[PDB]
Symmetry: D2
Subunit: 258 residues, 4 copies
């Protein structure tokens, strides 16, 4: 299936690790031009693989919590490529800021997750209008299921779903589509670090995997990526405002199944 | 994006008109083998176009309300191709059976819409298990929005969404994925005939189109088809139980927007 | 909170057992007049309790799958009371008709569950229009979660949710509100009979109860009843089309919680 | 229907205007003790009416964006009453902070809306645990429908829905229920101030009212209040994590209906 993304310029925040890395790699495979915005330099093998698929792919160092850095990096992207066709808001961290944490920690979680999705859309939208481009926001099933001890992240992830509907409304007349992908359990460096905070990470991981209805296994980054890239493409040309769950049945199927 | 559907055998009910026709054509383009189950012979140009893309594509005359015909046609498909990789339940008719119609008419609507989705799954599932295949059910936004004067169809369409979740549960350990696509307004022969039941079809059509948030235009059959075929493919290998709205924002965006 | 249901005539199908019985009892407590439609005679102590709260409460023997019986019982209720203010569609049975069962069994499940909800609305709606009355449909979380081996029931329960939206649309100009209540696990005679089909019923029961997030216990019939009766009352005067989940968090909260 | 809220102490933020005022008044009618947290003095006639129903009803001057003020007012409420049985997070403002506004404005909208819902829960939860109390969060249909030009508010309102699920999970073992109410259009001082920003407010108002499916009229503050108070009560003892739409069908019914 031709996605007609050849030579389309797409910013992917957190685009060199986990889900974001898989999105960048799939974009490159489709001959789109992924532009990774991330705070740490990507690994060399990842950069090699990206460039082999699409030699124009690139990386810009950006701490997304710095509004000026987002501003300047979008500007640099336009200066370098002359257009912007997509934005994937993806950087995030399940930071375990619960009800006991207090205001300052809760707000810091909003900064780490929610506020840069807005900032990036704010700077990207004028350019997306020019190309009738698209936005994909990566949320989390915790936006609708909860988890415990993670008010900051949950709030952020739910806000991201609301913003998906709001931006779809706001940008409809410009032909800019805005959608979200909702993963549940995906093995990534983030998941590795999160599970490591538990008393018994090996047992806990096995416990969780056993609860995923389809295959009793975690979703892969490539599975999230392929739905995300489909949503960026004109194959989804009448899909906007939508929240696509790619989760092995985690969110919606009977909790009682084994 | 390679969908890896080459030589996969997929039954498409009502597969030579409107949405179903577009699904068959996209399957053929991807080198899958669509098998059209429908009561009236397809038009010659459609058959030509299907065969040009995939010469093994075929059509079986089936009145889906006849359980024996469904049974025998699935059997014939297995006899002819040796396997079955997908089922698209798609045949349907918005038949305007309201609260005033009475039991017999309501049940007749269930027969025209709901009951053959079950019958087809009943006969197809043993074969889908063998290939770890997939099912897509085509529902309607009326399952969640209502419409008025159409209890029979609405009930059927809502049951189809429930069956999507149920079959996803039932078949999870066999690796058979089951998903639904929810269109709102799509210009097809069905829509042409439905709108013709109104006092002023031209004005009514324009009224409705003006209410679709994205572009103030109807969704195309190709737009429904591309999401449906994506869902049949291993690119959606961890998506099951899901209801994908392809509707230009019809269902979920603020009713007040113009 | 005054519910202003005094002397309001409400038919409750299956209204003398489990959830339906609790609905009738709460209606009687609020001085409404419940009219039980059921095929078997209510327990003497139940009727005694009902009559102590509301001496005009009554029972009509009805097999709901017989259309003429529904017709005649509604006519008789109108002959007796001169009005109808509410309809609670509640009778149902989780009959375990799965994918392997075949057409005849699936349609029989529809008859046992879905079709009489339609028949009852069909016959009651003219009278509810006259009183600006209300409908409550009792569905099941299986409509959205699935369960396995129960296509007939799931389909019916999902159709009942769609019909709730459809009737809310159809009846809006007459001021007739239509809503649904979605239970998950409630201890009733049906649950006792259902759980008895399992190899170890006592253990299966405990296993299911442990998965209910709020309190690790089943919902009570009175809990379902109080939401259902609230929805019948003018305290819910702008609520229509809605599906209220009364399930201790079963449907929506993280499947992983213990 | 006895709600068993007599002498239960409930903080209502913004509890003397619009929806919050109606919630406080209904609480007082049910013999609960509403404690109004608001930055401006309540109207004299409102306080008179409140005190006639519940003479222990009180008001504490609080700017909710000041964390220390939230902290001290909760402490004072506990010093006065010795207990806290409920929290209604209600204060909010649709502040029209869109995509073009920038980071600072977006975060300010979060402060005006989202962040104090967290702060209030943070300070109230220890006390609600002690009484097995309840939380109700007032969100907005814009969380799911969007609106345009209001990213800050939409994000906040969506975060409040996610927080409802998250807190329901976090607090389940303490028997503390957490639910949300979602209004669409309600005539309040906020609505008057919001509609006044439009070029033709009277006409805009009529245009919006005509789009509400049930009765073509706005929902009343009392309608929102009665659902919110039901959710605070033990009549909703197995309802947690839920989002109750009280909107005349605005969110869920066919956008095409007139
Ligand atoms: N993994 C899951 O199971 C799962 C489930 C549901 C939703 N999600 C969502 O999926 C998204 C991606 O998650 P992931 O698991 O793929 O995470 P990941 O492997 O940690 O990748 C995220 C990348 O973003 C970077 N990043 C984070 N914050 C940044 C910032 N403020 N500025 C610049 N770069 C930043 C990270 O860098 P460093 O780590 O080196 O600092 C990392 O390279 C997140 O939004 C998450 O909420 C994940
Ligand atoms: N068009 C829309 O706006 C829209 C919106 C939401 C959902 N949908 C759903 O999309 C699906 C397809 O709709 P469509 O608009 O593409 O309809 P369509 O153009 O009429 O195509 C449906 C085909 O199925 C055939 N068919 C119907 N019932 C049959 C039966 N019992 N046995 C054998 N063949 C049968 C029809 O044949 P004949 O007509 O020649 O008899 C026709 O060829 C339906 O399930 C519908 O509910 C459509
Ligand atoms: N219990 C649960 O956990 C649960 C969960 C989700 C949804 N629900 C739903 O809640 C509703 C009530 O369930 P329940 O557990 O309270 O069941 P219940 O205790 O069996 O009560 C149902 C009553 O309806 C009667 N009935 C059934 N079919 C009838 C018919 N065709 N004609 C006349 N009377 C009929 C039954 O009579 P007989 O049995 O004597 O024949 C019985 O008295 C159902 O719609 C069910 O789907 C229940
Ligand atoms: N009205 C609607 O159509 C509608 C629809 C959907 C959702 N909602 C939601 O319903 C809730 C209540 O809305 P409403 O229409 O009833 O508004 P309202 O009449 O303006 O009442 C809100 C009250 O809260 C106060 N308040 C606001 N921010 C405060 C703060 N930071 N500190 C202390 N007090 C504060 C206001 O005081 P001052 O105004 O005097 O400063 C006012 O008294 C909001 O959360 C809103 O999002 C309303
Ligand atoms: C780190 C991961 O964050 C995700 O959003 C959650 O859905 C997973 O369960 C896990 O906690
Ligand atoms: C014929 C079509 O049926 C579909 O299901 C509906 O969604 C459309 O509005 C139209 O009535
Ligand atoms: C008998 C009961 O039927 C209900 O609908 C289900 O939700 C329960 O799990 C149980 O099977
Ligand atoms: C002021 C009101 O805010 C609410 O949240 C919205 O739902 C209404 O449409 C209106 O804008
Ligand atoms: Cl917590
Ligand atoms: Cl009707
Ligand atoms: Cl089954
Ligand atoms: Cl905007
Ligand atoms: Mg490294
Ligand atoms: Mg023809």
């Amino acid at each position: 299936m031709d996605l007609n993304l050849q030579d389309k310029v797409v910013i992917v925040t957190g685009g060199a690790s986990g889900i974001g890395g898989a999105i960048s790699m799939r974009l490159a495979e489709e001959r789109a031009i992924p532009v990774v915005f991330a705070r740490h330099a990507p690994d060399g093998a990842f950069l090699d693989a990206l460039a082999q698929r699409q030699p124009r792919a690139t990386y810009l160092p950006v701490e997304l919590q710095d509004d000026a850095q987002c501003r300047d990096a979008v500007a640099q992207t336009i200066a370098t490529f002359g257009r912007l066709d997509g934005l994937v808001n993806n950087a995030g961290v399940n930071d375990g800021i619960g009800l006991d944490a207090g205001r300052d920690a809760f707000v810091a979680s909003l900064e780490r997750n929610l506020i840069h999705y807005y900032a990036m859309a704010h700077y990207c939208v004028p350019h997306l209008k020019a190309t009738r481009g698209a936005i994909v926001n990566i949320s989390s099933k915790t936006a609708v299921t909860g988890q415990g001890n993670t008010s900051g992240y949950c709030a952020s992830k739910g806000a991201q779903l609301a913003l998906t509907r709001e931006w779809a409304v706001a940008l409809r007349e410009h032909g800019v589509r805005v959608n979200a992908v909702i993963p549940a359990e995906v093995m990534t460096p983030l998941y590795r670090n999160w599970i490591a905070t538990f008393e018994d990470p090996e047992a806990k991981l096995a416990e969780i995997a056993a609860k995923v209805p389809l295959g009793r296994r975690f979703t892969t980054p490539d599975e999230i990526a392929d739905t995300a890239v489909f949503l960026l493409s004109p194959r989804a040309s009448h899909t906007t405002g939508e929240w696509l769950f790619v989760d092995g049945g985690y969110t919606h199927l009977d909790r009682a199944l084994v």
